[PDB]
């Protein structure tokens, strides 16, 4: 019932820039590549697809936490603010 | 299937006390507190309780995150690492 997450190492949110789903799935993390590195979570190019949404891993953060802390996602009021706040 | 998480703001792990159930019962974040304010996820005195084990934000990062994107906990050997990289 939760939003899928999937992640990759494409970039593209710092520049400002308008990311495609091919550059996404292109560069998209393996659990084997992530288990190998975890410090691939302090990339700055790492990219986090909240469902249908590009974050990097600052905003996305807090989403993925409350969903695993209270099995539900923030109020989108919520998100929107904290884009505001840490996204690029 | 997975870990369970839940958040509290009882610290006790830079200063590398053993923290107790009652204390980090008696500061649990609820979903109203941690919408209200997402920056609760910088408090330094943030413990995040995976399934039975108390970690700190850093440490529980990549564990969250793998859980979510690829819907099972990273290896045991692989956590203890991220421990000795991140933890207090």
Not at 12 to 37: C, M, P, W
Request: with cysteine.
């Amino acid at each position: 019932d939760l939003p899928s997450i999937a992640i990759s190492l494409c970039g593209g949110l710092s520049d400002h820039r308008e990311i495609t789903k091919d550059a996404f799935l292109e560069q998209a993390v393996s659990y084997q590549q992530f288990a190998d590195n975890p410090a691939i979570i302090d990339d700055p190019n790492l990219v986090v697809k909240v469902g249908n949404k590009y974050y990097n891993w600052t905003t996305a953060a807090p989403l993925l936490l409350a969903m695993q802390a209270f099995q539900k996602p923030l109020p989108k009021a919520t998100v929107e603010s904290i884009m505001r706040d840490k996204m690029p």
